[PDB]
């Protein structure tokens, strides 16, 4: 079975063979060169309205795990920031690396964090996530860095479930998780127009990368790496790393709020 990943033969450097947009003009992630960041008075503070969020299940999809949210109504939305309109939360997931010194997708002056959380939202003007994913203003992903140092109790609630979804296709019920519990205390951000960081690599994402990381311990990072890319019965392939490296900026502009 041919499907993509982060291995020797199916990894990021190969994705362009199957998804030519991989070498497109607005790919993600990117390195954020802080000396080059532009101040734009049009940018607003982020509004993350997650009080009534309804988490459903946690799923191992064979490339990461998603905590899925009910997006049938305006229950958990993102607005303001760089955005026009309302964007509904559909899921969050993580990327990580094989050791604590690497694993974030975005980098800041070439510095890599241990992991990166992605909160994925879609523009309600399009009716559904799939339709939104094919438009330049269709998606908004909030990225949050995980910085190694101190264990994160809110994150531990997520990690406590991973033993239930060790393998590809496994899912587990995962109710009453507040995705706001994984945000930092300050919501300063960088923003730029980009893409999904995995296949299908669609150039529909307004990226909103928070400046302030949340914590994670080294012990906690071990837990991410216990997942399997493969389905049960197949040869074991540990989910040691699942990050795409920085892609060329190509004269896009990174803006910063409040500077």
Ligand X SMILES: NS(=O)(=O)c1ccc(C(=O)NCC(=O)NCCc2c[nH]cn2)cc1
Return residues touching Zn ion (CB under 5 A): 118
> Is 106 marked as a binding-site residue?
no
Residue 17's Cβ-side half-sphere holds a number of Cα atoms within 13 Å equal to 9
> Is 93 marked as a binding-site residue?
yes
Cβ atoms of 161 and 175 closer than 8 Å: no
Which residue in 2, 9, 14, 63 is the catalytic one? 63
Contacts (CB under 5 A) with Cu ion, residues 112-141: 128-129
List residues near ligand X by CB under 6 A.
Answer: 71, 90-91, 118, 120, 129, 141, 196-198
Residues with Cβ within 8 Å of 252's Cβ and at least 6 positions away in sequence, in order, are 26, 30, 192, 193, 194
Strands 139-148 and 205-210, bridge-based pairing: parallel
Q: How far apart are CA 142 and CA 157, in angstroms?
A: 20
Instruction: Name the closest residue to Zn ion (Cβ).
Output: 118
Closest approach of Cβ 100 to Cu ion, in Å?
26
Query: Active-site residue 63, yes or no?
Result: yes
Pick the closer one to ligand X by CB: 104 or 197.
197
Closest approach of Cβ 68 to ligand X, in Å?
7
Q: How far apart are CA 167 and CA 82, in angstroms?
A: 37
Where do contacts with Cu ion occur on this chain (CB under 5 A)?
3-4, 18, 62, 128-129
- Binding-site positions for Zn(2+) read 93, 95, 118
């Amino acid at each position: 079975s041919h499907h993509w990943g982060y291995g020797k033969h199916n990894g990021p450097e190969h994705w362009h063979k199957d998804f030519p947009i991989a070498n497109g003009e607005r790919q993600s992630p990117v390195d954020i060169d802080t000396k080059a960041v532009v101040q734009d008075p049009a940018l607003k503070p982020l509004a993350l309205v997650y009080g009534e969020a309804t988490s459903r299940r946690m799923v191992n999809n064979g490339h990461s795990f998603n905590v899925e949210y009910d997006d049938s109504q305006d229950k958990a939305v993102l607005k303001d920031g760089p955005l026009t309109g309302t964007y509904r939360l559909v899921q969050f997931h993580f990327h990580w690396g094989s050791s604590d010194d690497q694993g974030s997708e975005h980098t800041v002056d070439r510095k890599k964090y241990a992991a990166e959380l992605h909160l994925v939202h879609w523009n309600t003007k399009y009716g559904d996530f799939g339709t939104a994913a094919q438009q330049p203003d269709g998606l908004a992903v909030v990225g949050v860095f995980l910085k190694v140092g101190d264990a994160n109790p809110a994150l531990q609630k997520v990690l406590d479930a991973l033993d239930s979804i060790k393998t590809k296709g496994k899912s587990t019920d995962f109710p009453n998780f507040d995705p706001g519990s994984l945000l930092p205390n300050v919501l300063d951000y960088w923003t730029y127009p980009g893409s999904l960081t995995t296949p299908p690599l669609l150039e529909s994402v307004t990226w909103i990368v928070l400046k302030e990381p949340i914590s994670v311990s080294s012990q906690q990072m071990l837990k991410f790496r216990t997942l399997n890319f493969n389905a049960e019965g197949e040869p074991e392939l540990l989910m040691l790393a699942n990050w795409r490296p920085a892609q060329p900026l190509k004269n896009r502009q990174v803006r910063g709020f409040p500077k």
